[PDB]
């Protein structure tokens, strides 16, 4: 199927508490394989998936060296952005970076992306063309001009279309038994009466991988989109996900309702009735 | 801006009394990243609680999983105590095993 490799970076200044913190998380689809935390004792890029452990010391040395070099870029950027926005030296500010690349079933490049935020708002983004930048304000316009002059898009595109896809392809092959697997949802329904007039019908999807799932309630064929309570997909802790969808039904009409489960682990969508 | 955390207190596997499991606290959709999360057993702080590595969503808001190995009993009460700039007082969310 379709696959992706994504890296998430968070840089937080904490004036007076400590040094700016840096967390780097690496993902292949919905599986984390690497981590770096400036607060942790190792000061190395650490393995978080079993299929990355087979990578030699030169991989680990390279990743540490490079993720350290990035944290240093982000530390000077925290200072640069405080200066752009005329913010106080005593406030806490946060830079967030996400980049990655997608491959199809053939293993060929699909899309590449690079997005940056400052204080939870868009800052600068690499455009779909991988050739230009979109600055969200006057300050991100200064950065845009720096990056245009430094040929940052050429550097980013060469990585996303080359090195990123070549690494993703290696990870998918080494991690085949887990990465190239789908776990279908283990569905069940539960009845929770509210009164003599109404009751709750909760549809559960547990143990599924990847996290993408659609739970839909229907009544005689019509979707109940406006009246379905949906929880956010949550991690089970073992690499799988959980989700539920609930709907309040009139006491003698439970049989008029069906829940539709859509997952790539399922060859045909499921339909649950009480 | 500043976004309030969303809290979910649940177990890895469906709860069976006297059977070993994992108690999860999933905090999501918050900004800034600075947060305090404690897992409690009868209002008392659980000593060894592990957490995931900080990540974020399409809106830039963060998420984290805090977990501990626990064995659910019939009478023992479990909860999550969360603190964030966004809260007047830390928020206690109790573990409802039918959620």
């Amino acid at each position, epitope marked *: 199927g379709s696959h992706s490799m994504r890296y998430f970076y968070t840089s937080v200044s904490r004036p007076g508490r400590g040094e700016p913190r840096f967390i780097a998380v690496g993902y292949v689809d919905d599986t984390q394989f690497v981590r770096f935390d400036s607060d942790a004792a190792s000061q190395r890029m650490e393995p978080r998936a079993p299929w990355i452990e087979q990578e030699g010391p030169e991989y680990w040395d390279q990743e540490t060296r490079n993720v350290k070099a990035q944290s240093q870029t982000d530390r000077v950027d925290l200072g640069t952005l405080r200066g752009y926005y005329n913010q*106080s030296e005593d406030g806490s500010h946060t830079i967030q970076i996400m980049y990655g690349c997608d491959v199809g079933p053939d293993g060929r490049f699909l899309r590449g992306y690079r997005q940056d935020a400052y204080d939870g708002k868009d800052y600068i983004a690499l455009n779909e063309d991988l050739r230009s930048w979109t600055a969200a304000d006057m300050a991100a316009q200064i950065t845009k001009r720096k990056w245009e002059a430094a040929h940052a898009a050429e550097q980013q595109r060469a990585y996303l279309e080359g090195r990123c896809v070549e690494w993703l392809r290696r990870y998918l092959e080494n991690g085949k038994e887990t990465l190239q697997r789908t776990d279908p949802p283990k569905t069940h329904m539960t009845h929770h009466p509210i009164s003599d007039h109404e009751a709750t019908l909760r549809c559960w999807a547990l143990g599924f991988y990847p996290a993408e799932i659609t739970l839909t309630w229907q009544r005689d064929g019509e979707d109940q989109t406006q009246d379905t309570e949906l929880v956010e997909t949550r991690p089970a802790g073992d690499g799988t996900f959980q989700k539920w969808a609930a709907v309040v039904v009139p006491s003698g009409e439970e049989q008029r309702y069906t829940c539709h489960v859509q997952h790539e682990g399922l060859p045909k969508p499921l339909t649950l009735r009480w | 801006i500043q976004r309030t955390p969303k809290i979910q207190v649940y177990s890895r596997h469906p709860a069976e009394n006297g059977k070993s499991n994992f108690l999860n606290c999933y905090v999501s959709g918050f900004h800034p990243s600075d947060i305090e999360v404690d897992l409690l057993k009868n209002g008392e702080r659980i000593e060894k609680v592990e957490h995931s590595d900080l990540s974020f969503s399409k809106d830039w808001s963060f998420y984290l999983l805090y977990y501990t190995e626990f064995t659910p009993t019939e009478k023992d009460e479990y909860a999550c105590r969360v603190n964030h700039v966004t809260l007047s007082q830390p928020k206690i969310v109790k573990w409802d095993r039918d959620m």
Partner: antibody
Amino acid sequence: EVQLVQSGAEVKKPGASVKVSCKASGYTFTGYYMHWVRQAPGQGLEWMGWINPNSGGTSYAQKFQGRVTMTRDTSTSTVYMELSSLRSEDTAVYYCARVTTVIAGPVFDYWGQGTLVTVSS
Amino acid sequence: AVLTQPSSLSASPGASASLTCTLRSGINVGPYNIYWYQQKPGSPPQYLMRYKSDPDKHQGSAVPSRFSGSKDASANAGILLISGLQSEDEADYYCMIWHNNAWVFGGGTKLTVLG
């Protein structure tokens, strides 16, 4: 409850060194940075620097740079502050103060009881 | 000194004491978070409040509403106002700011409640 318990009073001579301990309890020791603040008898407060008890990373105030060492023992939940090449001007009560992770109000939230270090020829 | 506090202030029970924390000229009070810590004899210092501005402040859960923070921009100062003074309010009061890559304290003010 969070409790920070420090070692007993010390009497030292100029040029010597002092090692002050601070045993932490009632929280995850590695999750919070520990700072040191001193108070000269009948005077004000002076910040010395911090330790990350997880990494062992430190930062000292310009005045103590070269003379202070902050260390920790994760196994015993203890932080240590060691001031060397001591002078009578170093006579003070030395506090260890935990710093919050949530940035909203307090910085130093929990303090030790203090350790009096008397420097005298 | 960066932060200068009066050494002492005295006031009667039931009255109001206005404790000042003045910032040195050319260092504007406005942008900074001013922290107040209270110190009772033989005890370590204790947080009272953080004040940047009326929409950016914090007060400890155990700190009564009769303790309040402001800033007097004209004086370039931080203020801790203690109303309806009590005997338990007799203590040393330090103000602090994060300035020039270090925690900076004022000398402290000894507050005496005239009982």
